[PDB]
């Protein structure tokens, strides 16, 4: 996990647990201990600027991989990246997990682009509860104007009337 984050090829705890059969609690404890050791080694020897590499969320790096797993087009992937970037400004959903934020942004852009993939299929692909995806979409429905990328509706490739209501 540290290597992925340092290479900006960051995976999630669910990915590393799918690889290695490891308990979550002592995985987190080991990650915290090794981050402390690595910071101590950096302070003792050569100093490195983090510039947002060890950050726990890293939600922009999970969008292209999840969009590839769902078979989404590049413009849908870019719009999902923009939506995930703009979800940080929203106070109520910024506390959610980065996986959940990325998945609900991807599902919102899927509904925006009329991609025929259901929320159950998105949940089965990305191991997220369908109720969680639906709740995230129903709470991001209020902030439609800020999340959806403006020159997309300026060029008319998508419209905000396409998203189903709550």
């Amino acid at each position: 996990l540290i290597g992925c984050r340092r290479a900006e090829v960051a995976r999630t705890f669910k990915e590393i647990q799918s690889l290695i059969h490891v308990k979550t609690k002592e995985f987190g404890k080991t990650l915290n201990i090794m981050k402390n050791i690595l910071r101590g080694k950096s302070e003792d020897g050569f100093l490195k600027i983090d510039t947002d590499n060890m950050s726990g969320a890293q939600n922009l790096t999970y969008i292209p991989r999840f969009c590839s797993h769902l078979g989404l087009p590049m413009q849908v992937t870019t719009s999902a990246e923009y939506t995930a970037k703009k979800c940080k400004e929203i106070k109520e959903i910024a506390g959610k997990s980065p996986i959940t934020i990325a998945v609900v942004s991807i599902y919102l852009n899927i509904l925006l682009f009329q991609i025929p993939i259901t929320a159950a299929k998105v949940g089965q692909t990305l191991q997220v509860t369908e109720g969680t995806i639906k709740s995230g979409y129903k709470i991001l429905y209020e902030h439609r104007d800020k999340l959806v990328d403006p020159q997309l509706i300026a060029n008319g490739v998508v419209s905000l009337d396409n998203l189903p209501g709550v």
Binding site: R11, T12, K14, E15, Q17, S18, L19, H21, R65, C67, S68, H69, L70, G71, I99, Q124, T125, L126, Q127, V128
Partner: protein, 268 residues
């Protein structure tokens, strides 16, 4: 049917009612050893067929010793209903037909009384006198159908090509390595079935545990730690704290690495 031979004790009288000797008076039965192509062989050798029904009629013309087989119309219309029986060997020697049947197990000069002989109820039921091969007749209206079938044998291919996945490659590779989905299969969940068993034990009083140990040593003298632990449900520390007091471990005997009762309590 497992059995041992070279029995001079004559146990076969008691362990087989049927005689072991080869049954022979049917050996004068005349049998024709007939070879078939695969369509007739598949129609005539499958066990879901052959209920004693008539399958054809044999005509023997003595002008040139010509044998013709004429099948009935009940089986199929694509196959011919007239074949010639070519006598590959008019005189066949040293060829017989015998049947093998299970027996009734219920109710120099140096020799060894063990051969590992498997006896079976055998019976020579015929003598092969004519080796014959079946040929479809040239003038039949289905000989061209047989030629077409035999051409189809070398024409058709029994193997299909590899299936190419036309789905998006990202959707194909979503299952691979780094993946969100946890493995829902329960194949070799040995850790899952082993970690669910937890043995938790209370500290019974010393008089009770020593009474139980003395009863179990009276039951059987030598004990191992795991067996006595699953018999007593006690912690290792307290179990050793009583076992060193009233027992000792064997270190050099054939029953080593086992806790046995002390020789003072052995006579009691």
């Amino acid at each position: 049917e497992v059995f041992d031979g070279n029995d001079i004790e004559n146990n076969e009288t008691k362990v087989y009612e049927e005689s072991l000797d080869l049954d022979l008076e049917r050996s004068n039965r005349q049998v024709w050893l007939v070879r078939l192509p695969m369509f007739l062989a598949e129609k005539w050798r499958d066990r879901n067929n052959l209920h004693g029904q008539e399958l054809g009629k044999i005509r023997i013309n003595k002008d040139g010793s010509k044998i013709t087989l004429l099948l009935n119309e009940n089986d199929n219309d694509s196959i011919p209903h007239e074949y010639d029986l070519e006598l590959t060997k008019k005189v066949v020697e040293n060829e017989y037909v015998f049947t093998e049947q299970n027996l009734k197990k219920y109710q120099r000069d140096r020799y060894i009384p063990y051969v590992k002989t498997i006896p079976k109820k055998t019976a020579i039921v015929g003598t092969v006198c004519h080796e014959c091969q079946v040929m479809p007749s040239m003038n039949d209206p289905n000989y061209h159908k047989i030629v077409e079938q035999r051409r189809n044998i070398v024409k058709l291919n029994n193997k299909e090509r590899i299936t190419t996945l036309d789905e998006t490659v990202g959707v194909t590779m979503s299952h691979t390595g780094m993946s969100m989905r946890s493995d829902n299969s329960n194949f070799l969940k040995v850790g899952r079935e082993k970690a669910k068993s937890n043995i938790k034990s209370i500290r019974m009083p010393k008089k009770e545990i020593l009474d139980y140990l003395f009863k179990l040593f009276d039951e059987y003298d030598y004990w191992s730690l795991k067996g006595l632990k699953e018999r007593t449900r006690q912690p290792e520390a307290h179990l050793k704290e009583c076992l060193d007091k009233v027992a000792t471990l064997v270190k050099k005997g054939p029953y080593a690495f086992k806790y046995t009762l002390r020789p003072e309590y052995k006579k009691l």
